[PDB]
Amino acid sequence: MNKKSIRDVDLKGKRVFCRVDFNVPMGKITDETRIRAALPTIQYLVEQGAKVILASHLGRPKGQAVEELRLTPVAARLGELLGKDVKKADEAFGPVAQEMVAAMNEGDVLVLENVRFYAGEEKNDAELAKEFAALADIFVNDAFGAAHRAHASTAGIADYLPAVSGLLMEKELEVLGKALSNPERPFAAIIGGAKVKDKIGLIRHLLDKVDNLIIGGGLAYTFVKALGHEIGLSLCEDDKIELAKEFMQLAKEKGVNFYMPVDVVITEEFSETATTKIVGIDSIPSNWEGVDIGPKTREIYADVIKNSKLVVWNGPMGVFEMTPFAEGTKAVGQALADAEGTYSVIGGGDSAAAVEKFGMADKMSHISTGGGASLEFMEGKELPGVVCLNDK
């Protein structure tokens, strides 16, 4: 894969429909980072003298104009950050959007209304896609995190216009694309979180790619059970036991080094003030539950991370917002930070939340903001908002 970006096209004077992620948590805006993330792209376009027309979702209006999910305050904040009079349209298509576009000069920025106000957005209605296209000369997709769904502003519009990546999307495709096609090696994936179900596709696909597979989080206790170890009260998806067995068999047959917990932090009651102890993985008491990877396992996982040249991390080692269950996730973050020979890729939202929380985000090589998109990409899916981009 090799997609054109805004670096590869003549933009001066062009109306650019630029799909961004301004889905900020809200009364007023309470986290700004998504708007900041978008700045290099917007600025690059402004410097080239493009007419920058920004489209984003915000919250869940489910196909009608809800008044508290308008993009008006996001446009106000963007204006502050750019030091520019950013204009904002209360419709994202039709005559009002059209006229505000007609009124633009080169280097102007116009934020269109929340694309999710319109039922046809989620349905990828062709007529709405054509209406969005009527506003522009070129489609720039800078919202990797929205690109896994076929929506009018993420994919449909590319039926009518040329289509290229923005700066965030370009980097996401460079890093994740290389990880699937020609990773540095050894290549480890760390797969965690609470549920096997959520990570089935990723486990399956990355067992064809990695040298090392490391599991943790509540997901791992299904694997522990599948080996015939006792798991007490730990989370287990009984209908995924046989899948887990087959995954371990695939790893063995392929010579993938398969790392699961060798020791576990256990408790009788999940809570922020929980009483815990550490036990070996074949010694989980019948009335306790596994809640984190133990220190022996943290040491092993750190060694594997330090000896892997590419590590993709999707999912924590425990419910790390709970103080007593955070150390395994902290240790994995620290090992990635400490590993001077390792390209660290944070592949999902909860792993991203963890590295921000524990202070090492700055030291990660790439933190994906694709969310459900980054997972789908790493499962080897064709993302509608990526496929539609024009080939270099």
Kindly list the catalytic residues. Answer: 34, 195, 349, 372
Cβ-based nearer residue to Cl ion, 37 or 310: 310
What are the beta bridge partners of residue 3?
391
The single residue among 7, 36, 60, 254 that binds Cl ion, judged by CB under 5 A, is 254
351 among annotated binding-site residues: yes
Q: What character string, x for contact with Cl ion (CB under 5 A) and - otherwise, covers 18-37?
A: --------------------
Separation of CA 100 from chain center: 33
Residue 174 found at the interface with Cl ion (CB under 5 A) = no
CB of 336 to Cl ion, least distance (A): 13
Cβ-based nearer residue to Cl ion, 80 or 246: 246
CB of 302 to Cl ion, least distance (A): 19
Residue 297 found at the interface with Cl ion (CB under 5 A) = no
Residue 218 found at the interface with Cl ion (CB under 5 A) = yes
Pairing of strands 276-280, 263-267: antiparallel
Cβ-based nearer residue to Cl ion, 141 or 329: 329
Site for Cl ion in 303-342 (CB under 5 A): 310, 314-315
CB of 350 to Cl ion, least distance (A): 4
The single residue among 114, 154, 351, 374 that binds Cl ion, judged by CB under 5 A, is 351
Cβ-based nearer residue to Cl ion, 130 or 204: 204
Please tell me whether residue 263 adopts helix, strand or coil conformation: strand
The single residue among 145, 166, 183, 385 that binds Cl ion, judged by CB under 5 A, is 183
DSSP 105: P
Report the 10 Å Cβ neighbour count for 37.
18
Closest residue to Cl ion in the complex (CB): 348
Site for Cl ion in 368-387 (CB under 5 A): none
The single residue among 122, 159, 174, 184 that binds Cl ion, judged by CB under 5 A, is 184
Cα–Cα nearest to 170, from 1, 50, 52, 47 = 1
- For the sheet containing 138-141, what is the strand order? 87-88, 109-111, 51-55, 15-19, 138-141, 163-165
Please tell me whether residue 211 adopts helix, strand or coil conformation: coil
CB of 231 to Cl ion, least distance (A): 14
The single residue among 194, 304, 337, 360 that binds Cl ion, judged by CB under 5 A, is 194
Place of tokens 């024009």: 390
Q: With CB under 5 A as the rule, give the number of residues binding Cl ion.
A: 14
Residues contributing to the site for Cl ion (CB under 5 A): 178, 183-184, 194, 204, 217-218, 254, 310, 314-315, 348, 350-351
